[PDB]
Amino acid sequence: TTFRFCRDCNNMLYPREDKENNRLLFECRTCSYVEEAGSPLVYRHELITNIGETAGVVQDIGSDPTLPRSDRECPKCHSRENVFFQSQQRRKDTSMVLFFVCLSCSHIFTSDQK
Amino acid sequence: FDMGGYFIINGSEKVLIAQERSAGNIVQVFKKAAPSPISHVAEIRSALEKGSRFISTLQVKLYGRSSARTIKATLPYIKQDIPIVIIFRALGIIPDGEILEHICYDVNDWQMLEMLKPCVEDGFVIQDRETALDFIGRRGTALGIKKEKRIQYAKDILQKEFLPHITQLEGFESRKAFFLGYMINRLLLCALDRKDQDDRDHFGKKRLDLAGPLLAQLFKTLFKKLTKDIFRYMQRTVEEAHD
Amino acid sequence: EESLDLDLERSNRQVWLVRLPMFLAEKWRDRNNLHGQELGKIRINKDGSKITLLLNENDNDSIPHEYDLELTKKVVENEYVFTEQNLKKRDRYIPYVKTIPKKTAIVGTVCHECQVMPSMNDPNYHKIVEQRRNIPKKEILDYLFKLFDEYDYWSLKGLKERTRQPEAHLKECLDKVAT
Amino acid sequence: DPNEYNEFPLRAIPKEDLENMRTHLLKFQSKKKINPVTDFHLPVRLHRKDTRNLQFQLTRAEIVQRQKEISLRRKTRQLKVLDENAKKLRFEEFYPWVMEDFDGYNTWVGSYEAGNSDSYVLLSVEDDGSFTMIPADKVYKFTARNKYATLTIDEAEKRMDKKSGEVPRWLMKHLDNIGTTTTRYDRTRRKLKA
Amino acid sequence: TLSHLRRTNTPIGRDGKLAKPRQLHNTHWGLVCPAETPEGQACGLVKNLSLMSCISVGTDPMPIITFLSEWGMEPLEDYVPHQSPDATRVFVNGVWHGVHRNPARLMETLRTLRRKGDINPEVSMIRDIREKELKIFTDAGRVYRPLFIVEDDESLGHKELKVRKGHIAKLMATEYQDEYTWSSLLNEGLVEYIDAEEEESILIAMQPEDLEPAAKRIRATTFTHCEIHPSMILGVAASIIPFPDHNQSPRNTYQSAMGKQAMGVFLTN
Amino acid sequence: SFNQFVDYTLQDIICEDSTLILEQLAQHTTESDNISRKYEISFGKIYVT
Numbered sequence A: 001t002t003f004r005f006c007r008d009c010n011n012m013l014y015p016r017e018d019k020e021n022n023r024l025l026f027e028c029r030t031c032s033y034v035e036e037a038g039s040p041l042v043y044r045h046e047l048i049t050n051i052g053e054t055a056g057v058v059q060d061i062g063s064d065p066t067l068p069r070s071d072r073e074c075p076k077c078h079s080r081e082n083v084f085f086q087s088q089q090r091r092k093d094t095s096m097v098l099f100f101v102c103l104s105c106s107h108i109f110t111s112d113q114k
Numbered sequence B: 001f002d003m004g005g006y007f008i009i010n011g012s013e014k015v016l017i018a019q020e021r022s023a024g025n026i027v028q029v030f031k032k033a034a035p036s037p038i039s040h041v042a043e044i045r046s047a048l049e050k051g052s053r054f055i056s057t058l059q060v061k062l063y064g065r066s067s068a069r070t071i072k073a074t075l076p077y078i079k080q081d082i083p084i085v086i087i088f089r090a091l092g093i094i095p096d097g098e099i100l101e102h103i104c105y106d107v108n109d110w111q112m113l114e115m116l117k118p119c120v121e122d123g124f125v126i127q128d129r130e131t132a133l134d135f136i137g138r139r140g141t142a143l144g145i146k147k148e149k150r151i152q153y154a155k156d157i158l159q160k161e162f163l164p165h166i167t168q169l170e171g172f173e174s175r176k177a178f179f180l181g182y183m184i185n186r187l188l189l190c191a192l193d194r195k196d197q198d199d200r201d202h203f204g205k206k207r208l209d210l211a212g213p214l215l216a217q218l219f220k221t222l223f224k225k226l227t228k229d230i231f232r233y234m235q236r237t238v239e240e241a242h243d
Numbered sequence C: 001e002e003s004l005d006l007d008l009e010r011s012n013r014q015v016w017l018v019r020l021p022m023f024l025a026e027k028w029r030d031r032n033n034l035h036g037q038e039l040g041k042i043r044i045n046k047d048g049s050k051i052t053l054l055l056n057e058n059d060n061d062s063i064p065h066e067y068d069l070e071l072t073k074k075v076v077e078n079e080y081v082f083t084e085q086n087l088k089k090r091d092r093y094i095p096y097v098k099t100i101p102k103k104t105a106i107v108g109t110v111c112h113e114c115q116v117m118p119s120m121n122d123p124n125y126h127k128i129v130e131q132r133r134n135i136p137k138k139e140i141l142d143y144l145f146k147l148f149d150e151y152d153y154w155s156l157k158g159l160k161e162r163t164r165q166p167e168a169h170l171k172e173c174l175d176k177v178a179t
Numbered sequence D: 001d002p003n004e005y006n007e008f009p010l011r012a013i014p015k016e017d018l019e020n021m022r023t024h025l026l027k028f029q030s031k032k033k034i035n036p037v038t039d040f041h042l043p044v045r046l047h048r049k050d051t052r053n054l055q056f057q058l059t060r061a062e063i064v065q066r067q068k069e070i071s072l073r074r075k076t077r078q079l080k081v082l083d084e085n086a087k088k089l090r091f092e093e094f095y096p097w098v099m100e101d102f103d104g105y106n107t108w109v110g111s112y113e114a115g116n117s118d119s120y121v122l123l124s125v126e127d128d129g130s131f132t133m134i135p136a137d138k139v140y141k142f143t144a145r146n147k148y149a150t151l152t153i154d155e156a157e158k159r160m161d162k163k164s165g166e167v168p169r170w171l172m173k174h175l176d177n178i179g180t181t182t183t184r185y186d187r188t189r190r191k192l193k194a
Numbered sequence E: 001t002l003s004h005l006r007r008t009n010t011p012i013g014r015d016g017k018l019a020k021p022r023q024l025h026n027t028h029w030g031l032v033c034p035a036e037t038p039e040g041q042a043c044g045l046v047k048n049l050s051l052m053s054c055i056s057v058g059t060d061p062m063p064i065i066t067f068l069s070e071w072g073m074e075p076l077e078d079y080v081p082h083q084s085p086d087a088t089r090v091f092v093n094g095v096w097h098g099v100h101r102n103p104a105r106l107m108e109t110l111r112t113l114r115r116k117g118d119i120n121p122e123v124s125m126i127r128d129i130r131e132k133e134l135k136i137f138t139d140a141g142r143v144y145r146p147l148f149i150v151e152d153d154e155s156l157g158h159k160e161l162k163v164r165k166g167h168i169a170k171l172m173a174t175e176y177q178d179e180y181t182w183s184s185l186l187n188e189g190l191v192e193y194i195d196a197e198e199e200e201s202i203l204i205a206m207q208p209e210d211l212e213p214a215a216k217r218i219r220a221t222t223f224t225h226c227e228i229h230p231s232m233i234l235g236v237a238a239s240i241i242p243f244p245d246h247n248q249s250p251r252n253t254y255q256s257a258m259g260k261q262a263m264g265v266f267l268t269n
Numbered sequence F: 001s002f003n004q005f006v007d008y009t010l011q012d013i014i015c016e017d018s019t020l021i022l023e024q025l026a027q028h029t030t031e032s033d034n035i036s037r038k039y040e041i042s043f044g045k046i047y048v049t
């Protein structure tokens, strides 16, 4: 789904079809470089998504003082310290699942058990 | 006990009150209502202490809700809502992936790239800066020694008037490109709902002015009235004398 | 006169690129200085990765003498520095657009970008931080006959200096012949 | 330090050399390494020209082939004040810098940078090992242009207008097969053949 | 009169909405009195500053940008997103000037150098580390209020505010002298101005001992600041309300409206 | 606010726009040449009482 660029000249590659050999050949519209396509997938709309609750993590989230602290442990390092905080996505239907990030194992883990 | 910062005009104690406004030169986004053809917008106010009031509004508008995924922008003195790949090429970023690197930051995410792919297809036709700058945006004044629109005139617009912060002199188009890319980034975050709608009613995004700025404004404007009267009677002294 | 093209022998030259703080950049852009005198010393490692500047005592210690080199860009491509001297002295082609091509010589390729930073442990260093924080009917009838012989539409204002006479006398004399 | 290094504390420019110099800095905007002494069909002329109809402007090889074949004021005004050095800079960069080969196969269009042209200084080694200090004046950035048979503003406006709900993906390929607005190298090759 | 000197007034229009700023917002804390509003068609239009509330008069930013240049950023001219995937953008009054690799050292350095007094303390700074951003504000128009600083670490142990009994004893001695000032406490860094914009990097304590050690009424461990006194969120006439917790809020509203219409004495001359 | 506006921003608002010149060389050809008659007016330091 990614947007490849011509290695000779960093420009947006477009799909165009072979006339007789029946293959998608990503030809550059700037220069004459051409490349066959790995998959017949071209375009993808994705009208439904549920993604974005997790990321935005820096390696020193716990360096900020404002995050609360708890005593549930990381289930890799067993250290009782932690940093917990809710979803990083905000829709009007995002969940009350929580995200728990530790400093010792430096790992993200949740509290869902379904 | 009369600690009081007032003024004494005509035998009357007289005080001025603070005025407020939104802070200028700071990013906001709005979510306009569904039935309009615009959905997500942005704004920058401006003031540079404060020659000819330096208003210079800006907006970037967004179309459809669907298949009308396009991003046009408006600038003075352009009456047409200009698509933005034209602006990137005109400011001097030709290769397409570098416009994409100006806009987004993590190449691994892709939702912005499908957001921008119809806009690149809008910008598929014009492949040169002065050809992009050749788009008219007439709005006055009359053409000088031109052909249709002077590229010198368009570059004079982009230097002198647009974005009256980071520079207005001659040579910082890459700072302009980065600033616009950050603006497009935050607009796309508001459109894709990873980040939320901003608030107008928060306090720190407002400012409070006082007697300093008020006397500054009125003193500047009456000083300009003064200076135009100084230029008056200098043409009138065709005859004597230097009074 | 001379060749209009560019020199190419000085192209093959590695160039190191330095940024500089402002007080330093003022003393190192002195044209009253810069005659060939040696003003600092350098110390690299065998593996590199730490280069310090040993500034000589020409500065008189208002600034430090201990400085470090911050090689931000160790490998540099396509960066070329040139020089310029003014010259010794469908198919419409314009060979003269009043372009003034010069005796220009490409004289170096940048290979290493670096920077001299004032080593904060120096006592003269951070002193600069408080500095930065602190800061005649018959004859004239023949004469006018010559004047219309000289030019047909002679000016009335130009008639004034050619006469330098009473103008009422001149006006009466002008009306008798022509305009 | 043990002398494992090329110690040469700086010599400097002759001051009498130092008048009439302008020593700028050049950069190309491409990931691949470019060396013009290896690439260009020399002779190479550096000129400061306008760029209006530069695609329609003739190449130097085409010029050489053509040469071989031929052989009341209202008494009141105001100059609102402006900095003389800024005006001189504006009139200097009224035309930008362009270098190209004699063939016109590769051409490069320059532009001006104002962000860091003051603080830079040059450590260029000499043949003996000397390090002359040349204080830089301005830095210029060059990009390639018309390497790929660029299009026309008019028919570009007709594609921009809503004549098609979507323009053809290989419309540029169809125009190139028609042969309209070909490359500068192709035009120079056709002119040399003719 | 001492009420009427500190007044503020916005324009809106004729009718307006209601979630729009006719009613109060949570951002208003420590700055404007939540009781002293006028009544009748303009309630929530005019509003009245806090007691220690102070306004920003601006300071020119070029020593700050040159300082920032000297302590190391990449100026944007050679930025590339691939080779700098995670560095922090730097803003000064909504202007891009830098992207810089190491944010924490730069932030603590700017905070220590404001405390030592080589920067005008009106300047404000925010580390929104969640978005890898940094802000610098130095214009005229901001509102700020004092705070008590806290160092987390302590040789005596847990966590403590820096000011001690000897400093306030010296303040008492200078007051009854009839050479410390508020500024002469500010210069060595014991209080610190914090604007209306910063507080989201800051945890606040209500009382000087609210959780600082580790029937009348009913009442974390990572504080950095405590208020001088919780009573001083009020305004001018709101001070005069005796026991202002011990009533209902619209009574405070009519009291602040009423107190402007009181006679008595106004001056002595 | 008052003390700040009295101390600064007034010399700034003068020196921002104090320049005004009308230099009349000849305003036509010759007049031989005439001289570049620099009618120059500008404001320097300001004063308060």
Ligand SMILES: [Zn+2]
Pocket: A006, A007, A008, A009, A011, A028, A029, A030, A031, A032, A033
């Ligand atoms: Zn290509």
Ligand SMILES: [Zn+2]
Pocket: A074, A075, A076, A077, A078, A079, A102, A104, A105, A106, A107
């Ligand atoms: Zn673990």
